[PDB]
Scaffold this motif. Sequence first.
Motif, PDB file in Angstrom:
ATOM      1  N   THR A  74       0.815  -1.211   0.000  1.00  0.00           N
ATOM      2  CA  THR A  74       0.000   0.000   0.000  1.00  0.00           C
ATOM      3  C   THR A  74       0.852   1.266   0.000  1.00  0.00           C
ATOM      4  N   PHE A 113     -12.391  -1.373  11.908  1.00  0.00           N
ATOM      5  CA  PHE A 113     -13.339  -2.461  11.688  1.00  0.00           C
ATOM      6  C   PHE A 113     -13.808  -3.067  13.003  1.00  0.00           C
ATOM      7  N   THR A 145       1.295  11.977   5.217  1.00  0.00           N
ATOM      8  CA  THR A 145       1.509  11.569   3.831  1.00  0.00           C
ATOM      9  C   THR A 145       0.227  11.692   3.013  1.00  0.00           C
TER      10      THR A 145
HETATM   11  C1  LIG Z   1     -11.055  -6.090   0.897  1.00  0.00           C
HETATM   12  C2  LIG Z   1      -9.905  -5.246   1.427  1.00  0.00           C
HETATM   13  C3  LIG Z   1     -10.319  -3.813   1.737  1.00  0.00           C
HETATM   14  C4  LIG Z   1     -11.443  -3.719   2.761  1.00  0.00           C
HETATM   15  C5  LIG Z   1     -11.654  -2.311   3.302  1.00  0.00           C
HETATM   16  C6  LIG Z   1     -10.384  -1.705   3.886  1.00  0.00           C
HETATM   17  C7  LIG Z   1     -10.600  -0.386   4.618  1.00  0.00           C
HETATM   18  C8  LIG Z   1      -9.399   0.541   4.497  1.00  0.00           C
HETATM   19  C9  LIG Z   1      -9.023   0.846   3.053  1.00  0.00           C
HETATM   20  C10 LIG Z   1      -7.521   0.957   2.842  1.00  0.00           C
HETATM   21  C11 LIG Z   1      -7.080   0.676   1.412  1.00  0.00           C
HETATM   22  C12 LIG Z   1      -5.647   1.112   1.146  1.00  0.00           C
HETATM   23  C13 LIG Z   1      -5.436   2.618   1.191  1.00  0.00           C
HETATM   24  C14 LIG Z   1      -4.151   3.041   0.491  1.00  0.00           C
HETATM   25  C15 LIG Z   1      -3.948   2.404  -0.877  1.00  0.00           C
HETATM   26  C16 LIG Z   1      -2.993   3.209  -1.747  1.00  0.00           C
HETATM   27  C17 LIG Z   1      -1.809   3.758  -0.969  1.00  0.00           C
HETATM   28  C18 LIG Z   1      -0.874   4.600  -1.794  1.00  0.00           C
HETATM   29  O1  LIG Z   1      -0.088   4.179  -2.607  1.00  0.00           O
HETATM   30  O2  LIG Z   1      -1.006   5.888  -1.518  1.00  0.00           O
HETATM   31  C19 LIG Z   1      -2.015   6.624  -2.203  1.00  0.00           C
HETATM   32  C20 LIG Z   1      -2.450   7.827  -1.397  1.00  0.00           C
HETATM   33  C21 LIG Z   1      -1.375   8.862  -1.117  1.00  0.00           C
HETATM   34  O3  LIG Z   1      -0.234   8.318  -0.553  1.00  0.00           O
HETATM   35  P1  LIG Z   1       1.216   8.472  -1.433  1.00  0.00           P
HETATM   36  O4  LIG Z   1       0.696   8.423  -2.860  1.00  0.00           O
HETATM   37  O5  LIG Z   1       2.061   7.272  -1.007  1.00  0.00           O
HETATM   38  O6  LIG Z   1       1.796   9.818  -1.008  1.00  0.00           O
HETATM   39  O7  LIG Z   1      -3.049   7.354  -0.180  1.00  0.00           O
HETATM   40  C22 LIG Z   1      -4.360   7.143  -0.160  1.00  0.00           C
HETATM   41  O8  LIG Z   1      -5.076   7.299  -1.116  1.00  0.00           O
HETATM   42  C23 LIG Z   1      -4.836   6.688   1.192  1.00  0.00           C
HETATM   43  C24 LIG Z   1      -6.331   6.420   1.222  1.00  0.00           C
HETATM   44  C25 LIG Z   1      -6.816   5.890   2.564  1.00  0.00           C
HETATM   45  C26 LIG Z   1      -8.256   5.404   2.482  1.00  0.00           C
HETATM   46  C27 LIG Z   1      -8.703   4.546   3.658  1.00  0.00           C
HETATM   47  C28 LIG Z   1      -9.251   5.372   4.815  1.00  0.00           C
HETATM   48  C29 LIG Z   1     -10.132   4.577   5.768  1.00  0.00           C
HETATM   49  C30 LIG Z   1      -9.883   4.919   7.232  1.00  0.00           C
HETATM   50  C31 LIG Z   1     -10.718   4.108   8.213  1.00  0.00           C
HETATM   51  C32 LIG Z   1     -10.430   2.611   8.169  1.00  0.00           C
HETATM   52  C33 LIG Z   1     -11.542   1.786   7.534  1.00  0.00           C
HETATM   53  C34 LIG Z   1     -12.935   2.250   7.938  1.00  0.00           C
HETATM   54  C35 LIG Z   1     -14.060   1.480   7.260  1.00  0.00           C
HETATM   55  C36 LIG Z   1     -15.074   0.918   8.250  1.00  0.00           C
HETATM   56  C37 LIG Z   1     -16.169   1.906   8.627  1.00  0.00           C
HETATM   57  C38 LIG Z   1     -17.533   1.534   8.058  1.00  0.00           C
HETATM   58  C39 LIG Z   1     -18.623   2.534   8.413  1.00  0.00           C
END
Ligand SMILES: CCCCCCCCCCCCCCCCCC(=O)OC[C@H](COP(=O)(O)O)OC(=O)CCCCCCCCCCCCCCCCC
Lengths: 489, 489
Positions: free
Chosen positions: B44, B62, B357
């Motif tokens: 990630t 979760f 970040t």
């Molecule tokens: C089936 C598997 C997934 C299931 C759900 C997972 C929940 C969390 C999702 C996380 C997915 C990974 C996020 C980052 C992926 C890309 C990273 C990257 O390269 O950087 C891009 C970017 C920028 O980083 P840079 O490009 O490295 O500078 O980062 C992102 O876009 C991060 C996005 C984060 C989104 C998830 C936030 C959720 C927070 C709360 C946790 C879950 C709550 C849900 C439950 C509540 C229900 C009401």
Amino acid sequence: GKLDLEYYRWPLNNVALPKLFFTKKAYKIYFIILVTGLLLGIKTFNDAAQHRCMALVECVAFLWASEAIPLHITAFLVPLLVVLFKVLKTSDGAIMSAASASSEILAAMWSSTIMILLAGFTLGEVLAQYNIAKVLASWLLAFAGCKPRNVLLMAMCVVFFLSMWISNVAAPVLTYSLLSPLLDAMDADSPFAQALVLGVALAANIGGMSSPISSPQNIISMSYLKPYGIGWGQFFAVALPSGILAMLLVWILLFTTFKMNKTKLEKFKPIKTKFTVKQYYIITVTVATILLWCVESQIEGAFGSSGQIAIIPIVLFFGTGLLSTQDLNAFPWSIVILAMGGIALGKAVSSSGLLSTIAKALQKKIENDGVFAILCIFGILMLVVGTFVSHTVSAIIIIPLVQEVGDKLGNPKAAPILVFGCALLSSCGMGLASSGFPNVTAISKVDRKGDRYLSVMTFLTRGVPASILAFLCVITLGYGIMASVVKGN
Amino acid sequence: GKLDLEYYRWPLNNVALPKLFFTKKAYKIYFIILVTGLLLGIKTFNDAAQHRCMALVECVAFLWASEAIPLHITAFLVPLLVVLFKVLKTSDGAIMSAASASSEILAAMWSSTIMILLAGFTLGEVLAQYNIAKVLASWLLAFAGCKPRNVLLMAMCVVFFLSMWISNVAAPVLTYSLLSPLLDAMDADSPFAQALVLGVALAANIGGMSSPISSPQNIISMSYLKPYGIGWGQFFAVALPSGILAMLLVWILLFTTFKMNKTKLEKFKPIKTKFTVKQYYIITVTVATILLWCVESQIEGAFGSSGQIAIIPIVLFFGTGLLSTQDLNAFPWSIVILAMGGIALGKAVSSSGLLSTIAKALQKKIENDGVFAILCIFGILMLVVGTFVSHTVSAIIIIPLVQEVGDKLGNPKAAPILVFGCALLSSCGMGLASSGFPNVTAISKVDRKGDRYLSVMTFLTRGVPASILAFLCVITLGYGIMASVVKGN
Ligand SMILES: CCCCCCCCCCCCCCCCCC(=O)OC[C@H](COP(=O)(O)O)OC(=O)CCCCCCCCCCCCCCCCC
Ligand SMILES: CCCCCCCCCCCCCCCCCC(=O)OC[C@H](COP(=O)(O)O)OC(=O)CCCCCCCCCCCCCCCCC
Ligand SMILES: CCCCCCCCCCCCCCCCCC(=O)OC[C@H](COP(=O)(O)O)OC(=O)CCCCCCCCCCCCCCCCC
Ligand SMILES: CCCCCCCCCCCCCCCCCC(=O)OC[C@H](COP(=O)(O)O)OC(=O)CCCCCCCCCCCCCCCCC
Ligand SMILES: CCCCCCCCCCCCCCCCCC(=O)OC[C@H](COP(=O)(O)O)OC(=O)CCCCCCCCCCCCCCCCC
Ligand SMILES: CCCCCCCCCCCCCCCCCC(=O)OC[C@H](COP(=O)(O)O)OC(=O)CCCCCCCCCCCCCCCCC
Ligand SMILES: CCCCCCCCCCCCCCCCCC(=O)OC[C@H](COP(=O)(O)O)OC(=O)CCCCCCCCCCCCCCCCC
Ligand SMILES: CCCCCCCCCCCCCCCCCC(=O)OC[C@H](COP(=O)(O)O)OC(=O)CCCCCCCCCCCCCCCCC
């Protein structure tokens, strides 16, 4: 509660004053303020932080020793007084601001030992709630026999053995849970109940010095003793006979000063019923938690501390529903606060530099007195300081100091003996019921109706003689074994 | 508890498995483990700590949102996972060792807000125990009238006003203590009780952004806004109308979604009995504590923090015997653990650099979009983040970034507007019952029988729309007021 107050009225229209200002409790508080103000107005130490820390220590020690207010409430007062008295210092050596001091003193109250204590409550409650402590006690009580002093000896042995391996933070709580089938049927007024609760605490204090991993000060000293050639075998040859003799001597003190010999005890025929699958789950988690605590040094690269290991039983028992939210709310939280106050008091003493200055001045007048003289004089210092200040804090300051004194002496065995002796003597001070995890647990235990088994005075009339007995056992038998076991190179 | 388990047995000698492995809770735990392992195994984030911190945040979120285990047990689990996942970094930027990580994560749990919460419990108990809350509620309930929605509005207004001056850490507890004469007679199943308990929490969340001293993020933003020319008058002209409108909209949401309009309430004729001397002491101490909390910034040079001021009522009410040791042991300590877990999660998020970040990546793509677009996008980011992460942490990371973006913009009003809006929008995320002191207090509240008023799903179905309403109220009314009030120079 009631909304009304009683007054003393002198017609002279009339000056009526509440009677709460003319009680023994008020007189203690009046006297404590008087001494603290005198100490804050008379030049004691040249360093202002140390000068005010001396007044802070006396005020807190007086409040705890006299119990003018509840002990855990004094513990709550400690962080407030640390900020108000301005005793905390930066690494530079300047007085920390109140905002910085507020966060620093508050961050120190929650520690790994707090987590171990909570796991102790979790393990003790889960073992009693599912009839494992009842079965385990049926075998120990059968081995001990009908004589009350033999039952007392067994209880002191169990907590001594436990503190040898997992320290005396959780060992008393586990021991009291084991003793629950016997303690729950006896009232707080019973001399035998008083001796049992006091005996477990005193033996846990002694058990803390008997092993290289039995206390934080023991671990620190073992780091200092390794370069000299002292190992686990050398440590056990000195510490274990010293602590066993001290425990036996304290045991005699208990059953000769308490009228606990004519009490008729129930015969405990052992329970021989097979455990259930759920009970095996509790036992496996309980045993695994204890084993992980024993090998904490070998698994520190992944868990970091025993307080992180302590989390595992909490999640495994509360998270599976074996213990409910009401069970967690029924934990004795006054014990937790009282323990945090002691940790906060230790941080103020170490940060201000009060104990370092006191010990450094003593070092200059005994640096050329001989190995035994230094051990007795410095050991007396730890006995008094450790009574009021945390044993871990005092050992962190004193042990490096006695090391440099021992190095200067022409005796190549002086430094190992001083480090070894002072390490054991760092745990002897146990006369104050508000200092140390075993003492805090004992002075908070209540019977069925909520009445306390022990008082601060009862803890003082027996803990102080017990502290002296432990001190003499170290400097007579422990020192004699050291002179033969410890070589110098 | 019980010693036996029920099994699923398939004769095929036979493979009998306990039924606890095939329940909804077990399925939730399996799914959470699966997702956490997938996140830990798929690349990630480039930084190892931030990648594992993302996995940790997902796992904890979760667990809290599904409530597979109790929320405070997840809070207990948080430090263990922080140490095990190796997310904490040194100031240098290297991964902290397990021992130092354990000490650092444990030091962060006890803070000033914990002391403020304990003082809130103390004040609420002492006010209810000595019949001051009853008299105070006899007047507020008389003003509100017989309509249940008017009583709801009165409670929300009271908690909003309290949070305006002393923040929403202790304000919900005091408001619930004021509502005890009415809440204690109603069961957890009552829609009106659920509406009242949820509304106090939501209005406390909204009131946290309505004043320059209503929240730590408000204080930080006021420090950031002083160089631009924004003062108390300018802050109140924007924040107070926005907060009032958001509270009114949330109130309408509450009394239209809950079947709380046909409930018949008892008429509360005001109590007009004179207070006693002891009651005057309690009132004086309570008012003095509230005033000292209000003037915390003016007395920081002596007390350092509101947590130290919080000690004064605790000592003054427990050391005088007004509240007993049983009263302290009867505190809702599960609330304290849940708050500590939230603080630990925030520390893990800030130490790893994950949120920094993410915010930097967003800034690099919205750096040239216009003031309103940047405000809306960063407000959505703060809403999502603060739903799960502490509002204080997110504000600390985000506010300097939006300040630098506004400074880059050619509009001289951009920087004050961005900082102000992001400060207000940092408090809108309130959909998760396990995040924030009012939400934790509300989700831990129980009726006489011990049954919970609110569930996590009930908090989600109304907290997310409330967060959206607060966000829209800000970005429309507060933005319109800012466009005129805020000058750029
Ligand atoms: C089936 C598997 C997934 C299931 C759900 C997972 C929940 C969390 C999702 C996380 C997915 C990974 C996020 C980052 C992926 C890309 C990273 C990257 O390269 O950087 C891009 C970017 C920028 O980083 P840079 O490009 O490295 O500078 O980062 C992102 O876009 C991060 C996005 C984060 C989104 C998830 C936030 C959720 C927070 C709360 C946790 C879950 C709550 C849900 C439950 C509540 C229900 C009401
Ligand atoms: C039971 C509570 C007992 C508390 C005991 C507190 C001690 C009171 C001593 C009386 C004041 C004497 C001042 C003499 C000159 C001081 C100069 C100096 O060196 O210090 C300056 C020093 C720092 O000033 P600097 O020299 O500029 O650094 O300031 C102080 O020491 C301030 C004085 C401390 C005030 C203590 C307040 C106690 C709070 C109680 C909380 C409420 C609960 C009540 C308990 C309920 C019981 C029923
Ligand atoms: C009536 C007023 C006194 C009432 C009783 C007060 C209790 C605390 C005594 C403190 C007296 C002042 C100590 C320092 C005076 C000289 C300082 C100096 O210049 O340095 C010399 C010297 C070396 O420092 P340097 O010369 O500056 O390097 O320091 C000392 O001699 C310090 C001695 C401290 C002894 C007191 C330790 C007591 C700890 C526990 C608190 C009291 C608990 C009692 C209740 C127990 C009930 C069973
Ligand atoms: C019932 C379901 C399972 C319950 C599990 C309880 C909690 C999970 C423990 C999982 C252990 C994972 C940590 C190790 C990860 C690899 C090592 C690492 O990252 O550190 C490098 C680290 C090196 O760091 P350095 O020493 O600073 O270089 O490795 C080590 O030297 C430490 C190795 C520790 C190995 C511990 C083995 C696990 C013992 C049992 C765990 C708990 C048992 C459950 C008790 C109840 C049973 C029913
Ligand atoms: C797809 C990837 C995931 C699948 C891989 C395996 C998952 C790892 C192990 C997860 C544990 C499986 C069941 C989880 C829920 C158990 C039910 C419960 O808490 O209540 C039982 C149950 C109450 O639930 P009820 O029976 O449904 O009312 O409580 C008991 O009676 C507990 C005592 C029975 C014996 C012990 C139960 C097993 C404990 C396992 C501990 C491990 C937990 C998670 C480990 C984390 C690290 C991986
Ligand atoms: C309910 C509890 C849920 C706990 C959820 C834990 C998540 C389990 C995920 C499964 C493991 C997947 C490993 C995949 C490869 C990892 C590589 C990586 O990036 O990480 C390496 C990373 C650091 O290694 P480095 O790369 O050398 O820094 O190590 C880990 O992440 C270690 C794995 C964490 C183990 C979690 C143990 C859970 C404790 C449970 C305590 C007992 C209570 C049970 C609950 C009761 C409920 C009824
Ligand atoms: C009921 C018996 C009394 C109970 C009182 C409990 C608490 C006692 C605290 C008394 C004040 C002691 C701290 C002041 C010491 C001098 C200032 C100092 O050292 O800092 C310099 C400090 C400068 O530091 P800088 O700002 O960093 O330069 O001074 C200040 O700027 C702060 C000024 C503080 C003024 C506080 C006023 C006290 C209000 C009342 C407090 C107690 C309320 C009791 C509530 C219940 C009533 C029944
Ligand atoms: C020689 C130098 C010292 C003398 C100078 C004055 C001392 C400063 C003020 C000390 C307070 C005097 C009485 C202390 C003990 C009060 C009795 C008690 O706690 O129980 C009452 C009492 C229970 O005790 P009982 O009546 O004896 O059973 O509880 C109540 O009914 C409390 C409500 C009545 C009204 C308030 C009581 C007065 C509170 C004063 C708070 C200040 C405490 C210390 C301040 C520290 C900073 C200086």
